[PDB]
Amino acid sequence: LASLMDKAYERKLPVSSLSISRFVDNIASREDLDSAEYYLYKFRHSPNCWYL
RNA sequence: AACAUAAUUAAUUUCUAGACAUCCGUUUAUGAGAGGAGAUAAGUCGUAACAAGGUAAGCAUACUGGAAAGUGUGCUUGGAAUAAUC
Ligand SMILES: [K+]
Ligand SMILES: [K+]
Ligand SMILES: [Mg+2]
Ligand SMILES: [Mg+2]
Ligand SMILES: [Mg+2]
Ligand SMILES: [Mg+2]
Ligand SMILES: [Mg+2]
Ligand SMILES: [Mg+2]
Numbered sequence: 001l002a003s004l005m006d007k008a009y010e011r012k013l014p015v016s017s018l019s020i021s022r023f024v025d026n027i028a029s030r031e032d033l034d035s036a037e038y039y040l041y042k043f044r045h046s047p048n049c050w051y052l
Numbered sequence: 053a054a055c056a057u058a059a060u061u062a063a064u065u066u067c068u069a070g071a072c073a074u075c076c077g078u079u080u081a082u083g084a085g086a087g088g089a090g091a092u093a094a095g096u097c098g099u100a101a102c103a104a105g106g107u108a109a110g111c112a113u114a115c116u117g118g119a120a121a122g123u124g125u126g127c128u129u130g131g132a133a134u135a136a137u138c
Contacts, residue, residue, distance in 0.1 A: 008057075011056090011057085011065075012064070012065065013056080013057050013058085013064065013065060014057060014058050014059090014063070014064050014065085015057085015058085016057085016058065016059090017058095017059095046064090047058085047062085047063055047064050047065095048058070048059085048062085048063075048064085050061060050062070050063095051058090051059080051060085051061085051062085
């Protein structure tokens, strides 16, 4: 899922709300939280920030 | 070369990339040298034209000649024969 979101931001393409939802749901470790925090930041600064 | 993401406010992205390459040509200038016209203006050689200009003049064309010109063939009068009679 991380790869899918990374490609979209590189191409300046919108990311789905379902995509960020799947990431947060499948957090399995303390380290994963840190990565999700970065992607929540990226989602906020993206065209579909309102759809969180 | 023209799709793809996204969508419980709605929008993002694509909507391109080479080859502007020299032409075939066309004008004008330069002019080795070879000519033409015109004028300058005292000559030189003849005397061709103007008188029937001393071979009437001229046109076309051909040939010929220092030069004007000469000669042939056809044509012109822009020559003449001012004009009663064996
Ligand atoms: K003569
Ligand atoms: K004459
Ligand atoms: Mg004479
Ligand atoms: Mg004579
Ligand atoms: Mg004469
Ligand atoms: Mg003649
Ligand atoms: Mg002769
Ligand atoms: Mg003779």
